[PDB]
Structures are given as C-alpha cells and as structure tokens.
Design a binder for this molecule. Structure first.
Ligand code: L4B
Length: 346
C-alpha cells in the first residue's frame, strides 16, 4: 500500500464532497441537465441519484444532507401515483423513483408511507417480458404535441429498459421479480446495454450488482463475465475510452471501477482498479469536480434499440441528440462514489 496514494484518495474524495455540498441550490437540491426550450433542469432525479451516490460516506454532515434531500423529495407529493420524475413539471418515471427509493433506504425511510406508495407505483411499470419501463405512455405522450411525433409509436420510450430495470433491481422488493429479465438481456460479451445511457458500464455495473446482492450461485458466472468485460474496457492507463472521449470518459471509468469491485480475489482486477483510481485522481479539477461526461441519449419515441442508432448529434428538437450534465454534479457524484467504494480495496 502506497500511503501517499491512500491519502490522496481521501483528499480527492473530500474535495469532491465539498464541491457537491456547495453545488446545492438555495433550497438544497442538486440540479443537472437542461432542456432549454421548456422542460428546464433536472432536480428530483439528480438529487435522488447524487444522494444515493453519497450514501456510503461515513460523515455525519453528509448523512444530514441526505436526510434533507429525502425531506425535499417527500414535499414533491403532487403526482397521484407517488412517483418522482426529472423535475416538478415532468411526469413520474420509474428510473427516478427507483433512485429515490435507494436514497430512502439510506436514510431509514424504506418503510415510510411515501416509499410504500412509490414502490407500488413501480409495479405498474412492469412489462410482460419481466422488465421495467421508464414511462407510462399516456403520461409522457402529453409532453410531445408537435404533429410529426404526437402520433408515432411510443414503444421505445414505454418499453422495458435494462438501465431502469437494473436500478430498480437494487431494491430488495423487486430484485427477485427482475432476475430473469436481467439474466436474459446479458450480451455474449458479458455486458448489458442501456436505453437512455450512452455508456454500457452504467447498466452493466448496476445489473451485475443486483445479481451479486441476490446471492444466487447460478448468477456468479454472469457476474464474472461482466467483470471480465470491464477488465477489457479499462485500458492499461486506467480509463475507459469512447469515440467521444478517446483519452477516457470519467463517467464510464467510474462505473467500470464499480463493476470491478465485484471480484476481490483476482490480482489483475485489483491492479486494474488501482490504475483507474490513479487516472481518476489525475483528472480531478482544482474545485474538486470531474469534467462532465454523463451522456444521456434522447432516442426517438419509437426507437426500441437506441444501441442500433448510428448518428447522435451532441445537442432543433432533441430526438436523435445527446445531452450531458452541464453542472458536472452527476459525473462528480458518480466518480466520488466509485472512489469511496474502491478505497478500502486499494
Ligand atoms: C431523457 C429524458 C427521459 C430525461 C427527462 C426529460 C425527458 C422526458 C424530456 C422532456 C423534455 C422534452 C419533452 C423535450 C423538450 C422540452 O420540453 O424542453 C424540447 C424538445 O425539443 C424535445 O425534443 C423534447 C423531448 C424531451 C423529453 C421527452 C425527452 C426524454 C427526456
């Protein structure tokens, strides 16, 4: 163990936590992403995700910030299903609701009336193939009023989504029901592919974590296949390269680092994690943040497989475009979660 590197990991994590706590708005929300024409900036979703990312820190002031985040979410009680969504003006969705329920668990509110209502609402999104859809068709169709899209298929936006299913499978109440869908959607390469996210490391890490949490020995080979895929994705320099970031994506690398935590015995895996930690430490900005790289696709509503859509515009309407986390809060929270989880295994 190189104690200077252990200490820099502490200093890096602390700088990022300070960035994130200072980056809250006057009411205490984390905000990120922007649809400038009308939907504006994410809050409920971002807050649920960031709070969940910070939930493994031991700091009492961070637990207080998560308690506050949960109180903010409970005041967002305007939707009749009890779901949360991108922000106040959007309809509920399963992915935001799943992250909010993970935050609830971290602050001891899993058994609350609101958490029970929101879990029930998730059941409505279960599909005949055993996965979870992000949106109810009639709820999201209301936001698309342009003649050219108002009457197209919504079976892309309203079909089962692996990235959403993987996040909901973090909830013990759903893990068993989603198991078979998670198993059948694994590729021959050992990864999963998401719907909304560009970076397959997100879906792959969350899916492998849900299979690990279930503890079934039948799922361990699948988890090891995913870890092997992660090892291939991480280059020797310690990053995951993408077409957009051929010198490394901080968001993809962080999720890859999380995935590699699912094998604690293999020497090559431990060395790869150490390499990823080194690279992430080098990439941190002076203010504690990492550069935005959480790329969110807006497929056309009819698109059942955005992983087969060959021409995204980095953001005119937004269908066929990619947006990102302009505040770097989403990316930074992802990175600091991966570093906090990996540090004890350095
Ligand atoms: C990616 C996700 C789910 C994130 C949570 C928000 C959500 C629902 C979007 C809300 C804003 C929308 C209706 C919009 C707007 C807008 O209202 O500002 C302007 C557009 O030109 C445009 O194509 C669109 C399409 C957008 C989504 C429907 C696409 C999907 C997206």
């Amino acid at each position: 163990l190189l104690y200077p590197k252990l200490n820099q990991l502490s200093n890096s994590i602390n700088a990022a936590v300070a960035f994130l706590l200072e980056a809250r708005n006057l009411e205490g929300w984390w905000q990120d992403f922007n649809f400038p024409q009308a939907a504006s900036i994410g809050d409920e979703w971002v807050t649920a995700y960031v709070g969940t990312m910070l939930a493994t820190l031991p700091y009492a002031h961070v637990h207080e910030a998560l308690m506050q985040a949960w109180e903010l979410l409970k005041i967002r009680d305007h939707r009749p299903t009890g779901e949360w969504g991108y922000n106040y003006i959007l309809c509920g969705d399963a992915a935001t609701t799943g992250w909010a329920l993970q935050l609830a668990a971290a602050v001891g509110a899993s058994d609350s009336e609101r958490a029970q209502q929101a879990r029930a609402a998730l059941a409505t999104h279960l599909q005949p193939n055993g996965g979870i859809a992000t949106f109810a068709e009639e709820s999201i169709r209301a936001y698309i009023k342009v003649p050219d899209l108002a009457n197209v298929s919504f079976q892309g936006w309203c079909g089962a989504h692996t990235c959403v299913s993987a996040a909901v499978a973090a909830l013990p109440e759903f893990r068993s029901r989603l198991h078979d869908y998670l198993r059948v959607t694994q590729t021959s390469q050992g990864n999963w592919e998401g719907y909304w996210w560009s970076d397959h490391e997100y879906t792959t890490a969350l899916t492998a974590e849900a299979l690990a949490a279930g503890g079934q020995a039948a799922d361990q080979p699948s988890i090891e296949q995913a870890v092997a895929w992660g090892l291939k994705r991480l280059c020797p320099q310690g990053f995951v390269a993408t077409s957009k970031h051929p010198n490394g994506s901080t968001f993809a690398t962080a999720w890859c680092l999380r995935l590699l935590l699912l094998n604690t015995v293999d020497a090559e895996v431990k060395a790869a994690r150490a390499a990823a930690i080194g690279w992430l430490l080098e990439q941190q900005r002076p203010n504690g943040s990492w550069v935005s790289s959480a790329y969110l696709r807006i497929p056309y509503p009819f698109d059942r497989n955005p992983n087969q859509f060959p021409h995204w515009r980095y953001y005119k309407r937004f269908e066929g475009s990619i947006i990102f986390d302009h505040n770097s809060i989403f990316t930074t929270a992802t990175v600091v979660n991966s570093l906090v989880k990996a540090a004890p295994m350095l």
